Amino acid sequence: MDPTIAAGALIGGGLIMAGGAIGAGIGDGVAGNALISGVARQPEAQGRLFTPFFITVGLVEAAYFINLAFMALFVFATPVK
Amino acid sequence: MVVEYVEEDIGPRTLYSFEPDATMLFESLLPRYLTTRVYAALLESAASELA
Ligand SMILES: COc1nc2ccc(Br)cc2cc1[C@@H](c1ccccc1)[C@@](O)(CCN(C)C)c1cccc2ccccc12
């Protein structure tokens, strides 16, 4: 009963965190690529390029955080017990 | 023409975008510059002839 459910919960939490980290890492990488390029072309534009950047990042990290939450729900408060 | 280097003049500045790239526009502008100089020479010679 409990052992295989806990094993499935651990594997599911691992999948959730893996997907979240892949998505967050690559999304941050692409957005920061855009930011570094825009600052390398126009240094004085660093101040005005942080408002779209932090919008994008704000969405990206959101996904990460949500996945984090569910990871906890899978490993600390297993929804099927 | 002779390539003459003046100086960096302004220090770090904004990067200029070129469509499609710098070499195409340069080779499109070179004969236009020749023609502009020929035209300026013609105008100067006309004013000189009148004087
Ligand atoms: C941009 O936000 C959206 N746009 C949508 C567009 C279309 C549709 Br049909 C659904 C949309 C839903 C949303 C959010 C939302 C807001 C309120 C309630 C439910 C869903 C979201 O799903 C975004 C998740 N992203 C950003 C990873 C979300 C879910 C869960 C927790 C969140 C916590 C914080 C912020 C957003 C949270």
Swiss-Prot record, chain B:
Source organism superkingdom: Bacteria
Compartments where located: Cell membrane
Subunit structure, interactors included: F-type ATPases have 2 components, CF(1) - the catalytic core - and CF(0) - the membrane proton channel. CF(1) has five subunits: alpha(3), beta(3), gamma(1), delta(1), epsilon(1). CF(0) has three main subunits: a, b and c.
Cited function: Produces ATP from ADP in the presence of a proton gradient across the membrane. The gamma chain is believed to be important in regulating ATPase activity and the flow of protons through the CF(0) complex.
Family recorded in the similarity comment: Belongs to the ATPase gamma chain family.
Protein's UniProt name: ATP synthase gamma chain
Gene transcribed to yield this protein: atpG
Residues of the full protein shown: 205 to 255 of 305
